[PDB]
Amino acid sequence: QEQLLQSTFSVHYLVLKDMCSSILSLAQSLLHSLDQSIISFGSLLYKYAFKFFDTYCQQEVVGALVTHICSGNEAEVDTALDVLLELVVLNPSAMMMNAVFVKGILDYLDNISPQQIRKLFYVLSTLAFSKQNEASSHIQDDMHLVIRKQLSSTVFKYKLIGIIGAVTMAGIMAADRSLSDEQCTQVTSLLQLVHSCSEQSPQASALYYDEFANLIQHEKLDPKALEWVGHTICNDFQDAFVVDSCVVPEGDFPFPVKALYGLEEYDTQDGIAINLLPLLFSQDSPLCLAPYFRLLRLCVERQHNGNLEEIDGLLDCPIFLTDLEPGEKLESMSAKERSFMCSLIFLTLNWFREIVNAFCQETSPEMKGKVLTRLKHIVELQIILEK
Amino acid sequence: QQYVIQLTSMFKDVPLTAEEVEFVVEKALSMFSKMNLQEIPPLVYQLLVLSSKGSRKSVLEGIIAFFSALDKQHNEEQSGDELLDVVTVPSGELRHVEGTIILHIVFAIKLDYELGRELVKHLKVGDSNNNLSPFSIALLLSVTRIQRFQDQVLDLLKTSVVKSFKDLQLLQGSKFLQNLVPHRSYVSTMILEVVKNSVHSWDHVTQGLVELGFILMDSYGPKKVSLSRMPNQHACKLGANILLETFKIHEMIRQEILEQVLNRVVTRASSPISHFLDLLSNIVMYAPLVLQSCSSKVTEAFDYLSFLPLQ
Amino acid sequence: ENLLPFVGLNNLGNTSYLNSILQVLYFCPGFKSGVKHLFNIISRKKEALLASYELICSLQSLIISVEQLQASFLLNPEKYTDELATQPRRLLNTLRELNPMYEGYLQHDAQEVLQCILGNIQETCQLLKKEEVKNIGFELVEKLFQGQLVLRTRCLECESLTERREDFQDISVPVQEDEMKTLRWAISQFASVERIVGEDKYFCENCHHYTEAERSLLFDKMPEVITIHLKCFAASGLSKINTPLLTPLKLSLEEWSTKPTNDSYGLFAVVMHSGITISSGHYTASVKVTDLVQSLKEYEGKWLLFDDSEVKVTEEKDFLNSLSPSTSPTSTPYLLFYKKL
Amino acid sequence: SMQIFVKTLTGKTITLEVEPSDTIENVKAKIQDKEGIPPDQQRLIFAGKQLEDGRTLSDYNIQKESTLHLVLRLRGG
Amino acid sequence: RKVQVSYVIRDEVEKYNRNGVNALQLDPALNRLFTAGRDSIIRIWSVNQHKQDPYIASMEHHTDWVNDIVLCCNGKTLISASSDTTVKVWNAHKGFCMSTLRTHKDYVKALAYAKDKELVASAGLDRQIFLWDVNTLTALTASNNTVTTSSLSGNKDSIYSLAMNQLGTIIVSGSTEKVLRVWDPRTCAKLMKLKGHTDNVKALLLNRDGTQCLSGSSDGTIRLWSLGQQRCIATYRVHDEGVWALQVNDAFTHVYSGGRDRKIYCTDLRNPDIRVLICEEKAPVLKMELDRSADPPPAIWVATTKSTVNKWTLKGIHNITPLCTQPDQVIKGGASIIQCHILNDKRHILTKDTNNNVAYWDVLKACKVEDLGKVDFEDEIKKRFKMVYVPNWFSVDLKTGMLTITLDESDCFAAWVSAKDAGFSSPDGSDPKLNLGGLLLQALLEYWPRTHVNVQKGNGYFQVPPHTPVIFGEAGGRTLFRLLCRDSGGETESMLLNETVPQWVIDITVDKNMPKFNKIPFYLQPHASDRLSASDMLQVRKVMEHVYEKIIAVLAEEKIELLCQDQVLDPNMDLRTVKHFIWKSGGDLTLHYRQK
Ligand SMILES: [Zn+2]
């Protein structure tokens, strides 16, 4: 069992520290198994060996863990990364001076799967943000430059790595504890920088929202940065996609522009509508409509404490659309524009599939009726799409 | 024949299928002879760092086959009168480029274990396993510096040399079988030549070599305390020859060889230790060489001499 | 809202080592006229009509683009909104042609790049002088950043000293011995009396035997712009020493010169480095503006801090406080300058 | 044969004996032996000219009792 | 480490010093003068004005500069300190080395002696100071070989001088720290440190009861110190350059000083203005030793960087101009070899010495060939030129003033030459290939019984002179074992050789194993009108016959001319020399062939 090894490393550490290189070699050898019990045993062997021994053996431990991480096999990578995470949360001060070795992993970012990169950035960030480091905070201000030089790159893969790292570091930097200080302003500056950098490419733009809206949900963050990001995201989404309903007509398209799938048929009493058709026609930005709304909703619900009364007209809003029903223009005119119609139906169905996810927790009866009608609309669209 | 170094940029970012990369690596194999000897290691580095996301068996197989063929040709046409004679690239260049390339391949294998597993499964042996060569033996001996592959390559080498000595003992025992086939270089002389060739200032194979010698000696020692004894005796003789050969050439390792032999021979277990004793007597023939490097292990061996029994 | 009328150079890939060097070099008071006059001779030479003959014109092209863009912003502030910068492209391409080891997008040292471009401009000016003599401003680097070194060595047994003159372009200086260390101690570690002992001996020729020797350094001829170069690293596998030594603003060098001197070497430029490892980093410059509309005169005598594209004025006392080793300045100084005031 | 000085990284002075027929890489190997720095991080600056792996000592007009300051390369960018 | 073999080319007896003299000791009971030579030999001279040839004997065991000597034990024993890092104890009457102390780790620079305790101490550039009871050292035998030490600590830098007083109660050291540091030798406790002097101190003296001290310094001053007051009570600046040597009379009232400026003064300590110019020597004065038979000393002996030693007479003290102009006795010295050039055959050497005499030597036979007189040295080099290349296989050093040849494993066997190009005939009509270093190794160990095989003694082509000293040392410093060539048959010498001769010499001298050959790759192409390789000694003729055959003796030579870099090659010239002298490009040598 493990309390046996606990007693072993607690009582006889002074004699056992003589041959710690052999201990580390044995742990490295037995970590290469397939089951989970042996791997966990070797993991805790590394942990306890780092806990009690001399600083040189600690350097040897972190070197062995680094070469384990850069080895390549998935189970070894996950196990070693988890070991490093629990080791740095256990004894941050001893691990602090050995940050060079763990940072040196960042040169090898082709042997690591995309999911483990987030964990690596997480463990490095929580290493570099303990208040014992505030005496000489060098790792933090080095990583704020590493992220910048990653984002300003031209290779797409490093740009994606940069956005992942920037989001997962800003999350720890603005972490909610038991602040509202200049660190929040730095968090805001980092976020607007990484928004300006990755605003152009849409495939690289969707990842930013799909990481930020996960971080702002599973973890939490302090009310000040929350307030600022909520204000700017609400302003930006209100300015960007929202087109007033009373000015619905606009020309220059081969298809007759119309508004469909509204609720209660108010017929443009006030200005709420989704301008989906012109954006797609110009893209013969709208590709990132699906996650931007999710980020907006989750941010506003966290800012107002589960109160969605602000985004209320964004359930009965209609969508600018052509005559999506097949008017016998399917057998004929089966040109490239047919694929455009397919993508349009796909994207509006995805928007409906997100908007039904948005308002379900609320318990107002007629509002529940609204979301059920939205469900009927998405099922009829999913029927139509096969044509 | 000049832009081939930048010909690799086409396979970096765009995805490909197996047929076209196999065709281009076949072209590369065909032009290995054309380009130059000295330009090879950077090209090997480029192709092998490309190979992680694509073809992995083909490049390693081509490099191994090319260098085995080149070593074979150089060895066959090197023999002759010590005078003016036709020869290709000299030994001092060939051994150096081989050392750089084997070190690069070991590094690349250390970057991803899948290449090493493919290499090990590729050279699997009963069978002749004709792909074995001084270059490939050196490769397998240098991969042992990684903990993942140590036993997995040493057991393969051990079974290979046992199969070779069994083949020799079977072939010498008949006329008909000796009448039909022409002799092939049996792997005993292959390793016995690799150890001699290892003088050319590369030491990353000495540890694998001494470990192989000790494993191969221990596993087939005379345990008498009849047909299978002859391979089991030739194997021990080969192990002693290998150990004594690496003792003289390389300096950094000679302190540990004698320590292991002593630590294995000074026992009260009364196990048969005739071969270890013979090896120790052979390697203390060069008395000053021992005194330069390791004159301490013999001293504490002497201090323990009071406790052992009479024989 | 507030855009500083001082132009930066875009990142343009993984290249900031050249951006910092170029920005800290453009303000060198003698460089701007000379590097244009040399191209002005080149233009008439081409009018009369090479690999080493193109950088010396590319630099002038970059300088005129920089000056023209800065003036264009200056008389028309409405046009430019957020970023006031350009990108060094012809210079980078030419310098790639000059030395192929920068081909790619890796990181690079800054002092080495400065050495390369200075050696190349010296070589091409010397070649132009040779072409002229084959038939006042030809001396640019041989006069600006280069002076003469005087060495001596005293064999303790024979007590006879021999000299050995040398050329120098930068005083490479150690950062710590192996508590704060004044830069005066840092220089006197490099250019003062120390002995050679132990496994290291000086084979004297008057005595025909290995022996203990005492050797020193002397600054005979002083260039127009002296550039201390702090070896802010150490061996042991290697690492960076992020504990900067105290730096003065008015350096006087009467201790180590041979003849008595009355000179005042005042600081006007600093190139820093921001990282914790030898293998990476990000160079930021810092240049005092001192010479060369009245809007510019308001900014005269202040300190700037050039990042790649942005720029922010810092008052001089703030910059001086920013280099004290009382804390970690987060940007280790690496290559100081000193104009001969 | 001749014997030259190399002002080391930290300010000390080391002396090494090389002949004018020696390659620069051989001198860097000598430095590796004397101090322990792998001959990829060296750059021996002499009289403002940086020594390179192609030429030899006699090409640079280096004679007895000269100095070569030793510095590393600090990657940045 | 790595063990080198060396040997010195010289005559069996060097009666006269071949270099300067570092130190002097005068035995008053036997009228014998000891000189410690920079040529590594200590010599004993008679100072009887009777004999015309004062030389008596040489004691040769040291390997490098002898820096200090002290006569101990009422003149029976002298102890010497040398730059080979050892201290040796000699029987001064019979002139042989009895023990070698090896506890120091760098040049030993100074020795000190306390007559009333018969105590000596040694100190050097390694910053260590060891104290030794002489009777414990003399009691040493081959069984009782244990000696135990006592040393002083505190010294921060290399020691250049050292003095003790007669009672052995105060010891002072001088060093580049400029402060002289003082200890009590009886307890090893550190005592006060008197700071004030501003430079190295190469000369130190103490009065009998260790109450006053004189220091001499490279700053040119003499300073008198009271140890009871711990301060300077007078400073004398009588020299222009560094003061290197001090002596004082028994009354401690007149100081004799000398140094780099060659002038020797006698100054009265109580009244400086009364001073006497004793003489101006011909070279910097390094050390002086008074004869003290009578109160106003009759003479002073003077050591310089020159090989001659002058005795100057002292008429008296009571009375710009020198008191004396010619020495009273003169012990003659010999010339030092100061310049050496190895010829292209890598076999003969041209020398120049301090007298501007030029000589020609045979490295292989370890002897001189001819005196060439005072011809111009560089014209003699240019006149003896032969177009041949042979790889370097030894190195020469002149540190002892004689020719010392050193062999190293890295290049000892690099030079194969043909018997014909050497001075070794072909008595069987053919000439095979000899390795020079291997032949030399076999000649040096010719008398070692272990190389004798069943009788051959040597190599069959030449002998070295039997008296040549053969030295086995480690590279950088420590000599391991030194013997004369003829002495190798002894049982003690053979045991120590068996224990000391490295395996790389054993390989050649015992096993009679051939060294590796060297081959040269080269190109052949039709630009005169395939990649091959051959021995570096192959003659062009062999390539010409090769070409003659592959494109089909006397006829071959008549028809085919071989070229390199468009120069016509001498058919007798070998490939190695062509490559060294004619190939001026890079990459492999390229030869062009043609048919005529
Ligand atoms: Zn000298």
Curated annotation (Swiss-Prot), chain A:
Required for maintenance of chromosomal stability. Promotes accurate and efficient pairing of homologs during meiosis. Involved in the repair of DNA double-strand breaks, both by homologous recombination and single-strand annealing. The FANCI-FANCD2 complex binds and scans double-stranded DNA (dsDNA) for DNA damage; this complex stalls at DNA junctions between double-stranded DNA and single-stranded DNA. May participate in S phase and G2 phase checkpoint activation upon DNA damage. There is a cross-link at residue 149 (Glycyl lysine isopeptide (Lys-Gly) (interchain with G-Cter in ubiquitin)). This is Fanconi anemia group D2 protein. The C-terminal 24 residues of isoform 2 are required for its function. Changing residue 149 to R: Abolishes ubiquitination; impairs chromatin binding, foci formation and DNA repair. Abolishes interaction with MTMR15/FAN1. It is found in: Nucleus. The chain holds residues 413 to 828 of 1451 of the full protein. It comes from Homo sapiens. Highly expressed in germinal center cells of the spleen, tonsil, and reactive lymph nodes, and in the proliferating basal layer of squamous epithelium of tonsil, esophagus, oropharynx, larynx and cervix. Expressed in cytotrophoblastic cells of the placenta and exocrine cells of the pancreas (at protein level). Highly expressed in testis, where expression is restricted to maturing spermatocytes.
UniProtKB/Swiss-Prot annotation, chain B:
It is linked to Fanconi anemia complementation group I: A disorder affecting all bone marrow elements and resulting in anemia, leukopenia and thrombopenia. It is associated with cardiac, renal and limb malformations, dermal pigmentary changes, and a predisposition to the development of malignancies. At the cellular level it is associated with hypersensitivity to DNA-damaging agents, chromosomal instability (increased chromosome breakage) and defective DNA repair. It is found in: Nucleus; Cytoplasm. The lineage of its organism: Eukaryota, Metazoa, Chordata, Craniata, Vertebrata. This is Fanconi anemia group I protein. Deubiquitinated by USP1 as cells enter G2/M, or once DNA repair is completed. Monoubiquitination requires the FANCA-FANCB-FANCC-FANCE-FANCF-FANCG-FANCM complex. Ubiquitination is required for binding to chromatin, DNA repair, and normal cell cycle progression. Monoubiquitination is stimulated by DNA-binding. Belongs to the Fanconi anemia group I protein family. The C-terminal 30 residues are probably required for function in DNA repair. The chain holds residues 171 to 494 of 1328 of the full protein.
Swiss-Prot record, chain C:
Autocatalytic cleavage of USP1 following UV irradiation inactivates it, leading to an increase in ubiquitinated PCNA, recruitment of POLH and translesion synthesis. Induction: Down-regulated following DNA damage. The modification Phosphoserine is found at residue 324. The active site is at residues 16, 282. It is found in: Nucleus. This is Ubiquitin carboxyl-terminal hydrolase 1. Keywords: Autocatalytic cleavage, DNA damage, DNA repair, Hydrolase, Nucleus, Phosphoprotein, Protease, Thiol protease, Ubl conjugation, Ubl conjugation pathway. GO terms for molecular function: cysteine-type deubiquitinase activity; cysteine-type endopeptidase activity; peptidase activity. GO terms for cellular component: cytosol; nucleoplasm; nucleus. HEK293T cells expressing reduced levels of USP1 show a higher level of ubiquitinated PCNA and an increase in point mutations upon UV irradiation. Belongs to the peptidase C19 family. Its main location: nucleus. Negative regulator of DNA damage repair which specifically deubiquitinates monoubiquitinated FANCD2. Also involved in PCNA-mediated translesion synthesis (TLS) by deubiquitinating monoubiquitinated PCNA. Has almost no deubiquitinating activity by itself and requires the interaction with WDR48 to have a high activity. Pfam families: UCH. One of its GO terms (biological process) is skeletal system development. The lineage of its organism: Eukaryota, Metazoa, Chordata, Craniata, Vertebrata. The gene is USP1.
Curated annotation (Swiss-Prot), chain E:
This is WD repeat-containing protein 48. It comes from the Eukaryota. The keyword DNA repair applies. Regulator of deubiquitinating complexes, which acts as a strong activator of USP1, USP12 and USP46. Enhances the USP1-mediated deubiquitination of FANCD2; USP1 being almost inactive by itself. Activates deubiquitination by increasing the catalytic turnover without increasing the affinity of deubiquitinating enzymes for the substrate. Also activates deubiquitinating activity of complexes containing USP12. In complex with USP12, acts as a potential tumor suppressor by positively regulating PHLPP1 stability. Changing residue 107 to A: Impaired binding to USP12. Gene3D superfamilies: YVTN repeat-like/Quinoprotein amine dehydrogenase (2.130.10.10). Knockdown of WDR48 increases Akt activation. Interacts with USP46. Interacts with USP1. Interacts with USP12. Component of the USP12-WDR20-WDR48 deubiquitinating complex. Component of the USP12-DMWD-WDR48 deubiquitinating complex. Interacts with PHLPP1. Interacts with RAD51AP1; the interaction is direct and promotes formation of a trimeric complex with RAD51 via RAD51AP1. Interacts with ATAD5; the interaction regulates USP1-mediated PCNA deubiquitination. Interacts with RAD51; the interaction is enhanced under replication stress. (Microbial infection) Interacts with papillomavirus HPV11 E1 protein. The modification N6-acetyllysine is found at residue 202.
